[PDB]
């Protein structure tokens, strides 16, 4: 048997319903989502980190000339100058006065700290949604992970539940993301091969251990000071460090809908947007005959206490007269009031107490008891606390 | 210098273009697409056998 239902996407708050066959006792269903995660299609593109100015020993030739040999290291710069008069601790390295030549060749290499400190680039799109559900259909309670796309049902006791796709394809992430130290930021980094000096992406590497890197640090060699063997070099500061000092606030606190971010793998969860539809396929063996369940007669409502707060604040005493003692489900067909419990145990000639939540000053709602209906009515009082520490359990009717 | 052109997708045929600047002699360019690959982005689900 095919049944359709809808669920506002939000964890914690439970959901109660009864499927009512025209000639058999209603079958109860309870649903509780635990975690609703949303994982994107994310493909890694590159990685960056601190760089280190690789500088060999200066190549000095004394009264002669030299040439440049390109090692083809990334962003290599080579230069030769004349008219050098170097010194050493033990006097003069040379005796020549002029014609001396010195050659400098400089480059960049990845810092030793690349493994533990490195910012990753990511291209995100195509969010897929997963969920953990705690569902009980006909006192068959289960906790299970389910693919809530438009296929992939999960079956237990013959009951086949299918959670359809979301009504909204919104995602908190932008197309290009940057990851670092477990924090996530939506940033527009320049793409591979187009890095610029003094900004993010000056040094470029396909992977952590690619061993082939592109670089634009704009390294410039300079004439060393006279009477000293050394090589002065000038370059823009680390754009990674400039971005480190800039660091706009994190997505964990900037995202709308209050979406929390964890990255063991990149994912976002526990934030309410849209609705998830549920499709039940129930086998015909789970339906029980009416005579095998208690049936009531002359049942009446009374409203004992009212507080139309966020939490359940309506207490109702229902007085009944039963042919049998046995548990049955109680349901409110409309959204006027939402009950707290999925089932209530029932004596022969006792009275039942029911907790519910409503936002109506003058509620008048029809409850469905084991096989009959009763019409509870009354007025209700405002709350006392201005703010609470939990969300709303009910809807806001117009 | 910015230049734009189009190449009909097919392999085995050389394609010719010329970059024509006003103040310099035209520069010819010849491009041959040796192999064009269509890589789907794919996932695994399960395996089966006897």
């Amino acid at each position, epitope marked *: 048997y095919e049944h359709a239902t809808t669920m506002p996407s939000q964890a914690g708050i439970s959901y109660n319903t009864i499927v009512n066959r025209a000639g058999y006792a209603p079958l109860p269903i309870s649903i509780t989502p635990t975690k609703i995660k949303l*994982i*994107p*299609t*994310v*493909n*890694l593109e590159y990685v960056t980190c601190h760089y280190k100015t690789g500088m060999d020993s200066p190549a000095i030739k004394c009264c002669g000339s030299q040439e440049c040999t390109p090692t083809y290291r990334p962003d290599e710069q080579c230069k030769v100058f004349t008219g050098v008069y170097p010194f050493m601790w033990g006097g003069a390295y040379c005796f020549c006065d002029t014609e001396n030549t010195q050659v400098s060749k400089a480059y960049v290499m990845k810092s030793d700290d690349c493994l533990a400190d490195h910012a990753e680039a990511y291209k995100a799109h195509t969010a*897929s949604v997963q969920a953990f559900l705690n569902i009980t259909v006909g006192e068959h309670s289960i906790v299970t992970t389910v693919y809530v796309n438009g296929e992939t049902p999960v079956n237990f006791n013959g009951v086949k539940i299918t959670a359809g796709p979301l009504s909204t394809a919104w995602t908190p992430f932008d197309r290009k993301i940057v990851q670092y130290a477990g924090e996530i930021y939506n940033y527009d980094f320049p793409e591979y091969g187009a890095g610029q000096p003094g900004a993010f992406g000056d040094i470029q590497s396909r*992977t952590v*251990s690619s061993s082939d890197l592109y670089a634009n640090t704009n390294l410039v060699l300079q004439r060393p000071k006279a009477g000293a063997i050394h090589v002065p070099y000038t370059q823009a500061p680390s754009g990674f460090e400039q971005w480190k000092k800039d660091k706009a606030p994190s997505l964990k606190f900037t995202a709308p809908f209050g979406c929390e971010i964890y990255t063991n*793998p990149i994912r976002a969860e526990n934030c309410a947007v849209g609705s998830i539809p549920l499709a039940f396929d129930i086998p015909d063996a789970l339906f029980t005959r009416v005579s095998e369940t208690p049936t009531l007669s002359a049942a009446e409502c009374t409203l004992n206490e009212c507080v139309y707060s966020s939490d359940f604040g309506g207490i109702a005493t229902v007085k009944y007269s039963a042919s049998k003692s046995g548990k049955c489900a109680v349901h409110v067909p409309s959204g006027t009031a939402t009950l707290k419990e999925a089932a209530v145990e029932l004596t022969e000639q006792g009275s039942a107490t029911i907790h519910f939540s409503t936002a109506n000053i003058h509620p008048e709602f029809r409850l469905q008891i084991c096989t009959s209906y009763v019409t509870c009515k009354g007025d209700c009082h405002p709350p006392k606390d201005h703010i609470v520490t939990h969300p709303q359990y009910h809807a806001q009717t117009f | 210098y910015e230049h734009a052109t189009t190449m009909p997708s097919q392999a085995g045929i050389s394609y010719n273009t010329i970059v024509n600047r006003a103040g310099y002699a035209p520069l010819p360019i010849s491009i041959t697409p040796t192999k064009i690959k269509l*890589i789907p*982005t*794919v*996932n*695994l689900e399960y*395996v089966t056998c006897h």
Partner: nanobody
Amino acid sequence: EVQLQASGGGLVQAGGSLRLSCAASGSIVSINVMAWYRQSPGKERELVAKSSGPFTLYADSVKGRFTISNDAAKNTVDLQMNSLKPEDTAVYYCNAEGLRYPSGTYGPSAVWGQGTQVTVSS
């Protein structure tokens, strides 16, 4: 992205015994297949070893001499290579197929490492 890193090889005399290792890095949790292929100069690509879980398979010209072991926990394969003949010189590549990304953005199926050179001297 997922990659394969190959280590081992070198120049040795005939009759020696070496080990070739290939390791997988990236966003992977389980691997369905890992195999070895050899490419000699002037010829085409051929298979040598074939390991996946407990089962193993060997070619006609490699039986009884080379042994393949796989470690899915480390996602590595070790080809213990013995009884060298002059025809065994080639560049060896390690291949991985049926990759199950850990959701794990689905991506390319197969991968190919750079490989290692094995040369044998009479």
